[PDB]
Amino acid sequence: RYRVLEERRPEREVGVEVVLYVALLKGDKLAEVVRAATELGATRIQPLVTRHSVPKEMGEGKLRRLRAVALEAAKQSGRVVVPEVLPPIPLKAVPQVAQGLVAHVGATARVREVLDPEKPLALAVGPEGGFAEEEVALLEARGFTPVSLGRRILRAETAALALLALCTAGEGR
Amino acid sequence: HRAFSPGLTGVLPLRETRHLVEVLRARVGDRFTVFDGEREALAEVVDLGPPLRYRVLEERRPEREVGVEVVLYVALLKGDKLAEVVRAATELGATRIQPLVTRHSVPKEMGEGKLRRLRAVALEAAKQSGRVVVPEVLPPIPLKAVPQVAQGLVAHVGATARVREVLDPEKPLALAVGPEGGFAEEEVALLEARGFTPVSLGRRILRAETAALALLALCTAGEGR
Numbered sequence: 400r401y402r403v404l405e406e407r408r409p410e411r412e413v414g415v416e417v418v419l420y421v422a423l424l425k426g427d428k429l430a431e432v433v434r435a436a437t438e439l440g441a442t443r444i445q446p447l448v449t450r451h452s453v454p455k456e457m458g459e460g461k462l463r464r465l466r467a468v469a470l471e472a473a474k475q476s477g478r479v480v481v482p483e484v485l486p487p488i489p490l491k492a493v494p495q496v497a498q499g500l501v502a503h504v505g506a507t508a509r510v511r512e513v514l515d516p517e518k519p520l521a522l523a524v525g526p527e528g529g530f531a532e533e534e535v536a537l538l539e540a541r542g543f544t545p546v547s548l549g550r551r552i553l554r555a556e557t558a559a560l561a562l563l564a565l566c567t568a569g570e571g572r
Numbered sequence: 573h574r575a576f577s578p579g580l581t582g583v584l585p586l587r588e589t590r591h592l593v594e595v596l597r598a599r600v601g602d603r604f605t606v607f608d609g610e611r612e613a614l615a616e617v618v619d620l621g622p623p624l625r626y627r628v629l630e631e632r633r634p635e636r637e638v639g640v641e642v643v644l645y646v647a648l649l650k651g652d653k654l655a656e657v658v659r660a661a662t663e664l665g666a667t668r669i670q671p672l673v674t675r676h677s678v679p680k681e682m683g684e685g686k687l688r689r690l691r692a693v694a695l696e697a698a699k700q701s702g703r704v705v706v707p708e709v710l711p712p713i714p715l716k717a718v719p720q721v722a723q724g725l726v727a728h729v730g731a732t733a734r735v736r737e738v739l740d741p742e743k744p745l746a747l748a749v750g751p752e753g754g755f756a757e758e759e760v761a762l763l764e765a766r767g768f769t770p771v772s773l774g775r776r777i778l779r780a781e782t783a784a785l786a787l788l789a790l791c792t793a794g795e796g797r
């Protein structure tokens with residue numbers, strides 16, 4: 400048996416920090432990554448300018464739009480915490496990470512074989528052209544572990560959402 | 573052994589090179605397979621270098637499929653949301669997409685025009701995802717017509733089991749996502765009677781589109797297949 404000792408507002412956050420470092424993308428794609436990523440529990444979205452990313456910046460205006468999307472998706476998903484969407488930085492400026500995951504076509508390691516649900520999370524995804532093998536080395540040097548997303552080619556948007564889902568939705572959090 | 577080589581240029585990355593030579597003990601003449609996400613081929617070691625060099629014997633066909641049938645049962649969604657779902661499910665590996673007319677789904681049917689576009693989408697997405705197999709997109713059917721399944725996972729808000737705690741990679745997969753309003757209490761139960769195990773996609777309410785993506789990602793891309 401038991402007894403309702405005290406009602407409370409439901410836990411909506413994932414528990415640990417989840418920073419998604421995503422390469423700038425063509426079209427409007429990024430807006431969509433931000434929204435869905437907000438629903439999937441990301442806490443920080445850090446756009447990256449990389450070797451093959453077409454865009455290399457982002458006006459103050461484009462960034463404000465991405466922030467309204469995050470806020471709007473936050474309310475829809477039932478979250479109180481609004482993920483911080485930041486100004487794009489260089490891939491070299493990627494900080495050292497306690498635990499990081501990078502989607503790479505070559506790896507064999509699955510996310511469930513690598514993930515420690517107790518520590519913070521750093522996730523990296525490349526642009527439509529992908530990361531340059533020197534960028535993945537840089538990433539591995541930062542602490543990001545290369546992980547597989549299957550035997551099919553995924554749009555960058557999907558890879559980011561898929562990678563994130565296996566870390567949040569997949570762990571039931 | 574399958575080894576990652578970006579471009580199939582005949583030169584292996586220092587990583588794959590060390591692994592094949594240091595661990596698997598490769599020798600000139602040793603035949604192995606190379607790939608990069610677009611192609612696959614039978615290679616023969618030419619020099620251990622490093623970096624190890626090889627010559628391509630015969631171009632191969634990359635393994636693209638999940639390996640088992642993956643059927644997505646998705647509730648009819650408003651607007652063109654199902655175009656997104658279809659695109660993502662094709663690149664994520666669904667083998668068939670089955671729209672369902674549910675208690676809370678706004679649309680209750682789908683015309684020839686919509687089915688055509690979704691089919692056009694499946695075809696394009698299969699091409700862009702590298703697949704040859706094109707997911708079949710069937711006309712909608714009532715929830716009740718969902719058949720008994722060998723392995724079914726239904727994304728339910730009121731669920732607690734993780735996918736990785738139930739998933740059997742060897743059996744075919746049947747997946748179910750509800751419409752914007754979500755599955756009713758009677759429906760989830762019915763789906764559960766059909767062989768579906770309710771599953772959680774986390775603590776936040778997700779759009780039906782994102783749920784299907786998440787659920788599919790966890791069963792395919794996640795298992796590296």
Ligand SMILES: Nc1ncnc2c1ncn2[C@@H]1O[C@H](CSCC[C@H](N)C(=O)O)[C@@H](O)[C@H]1O
Pocket residue numbers: 501502503504505523524525526527528529530546547548549550551552553554555558559609
């Ligand atoms: N099957 C897969 N496994 C792991 N990551 C993948 C993936 N498919 C796509 N991605 C992710 O999505 C990004 C964009 S895919 C871009 C094209 C790819 N670089 C190529 O050479 O064809 C990749 O850099 C990676 O971050």
Ligand SMILES: Nc1ncnc2c1ncn2[C@@H]1O[C@H](CSCC[C@H](N)C(=O)O)[C@@H](O)[C@H]1O
Pocket residue numbers: 726727728729731748749750751752753754755771772773774775776777778779780783784
């Ligand atoms: N956190 C979650 N866990 C499992 N399934 C979810 C989910 N979030 C969304 N879904 C899936 O996405 C569909 C649309 S969400 C529908 C609204 C939701 N039932 C509510 O009123 O709270 C749901 O039917 C379910 O199939």
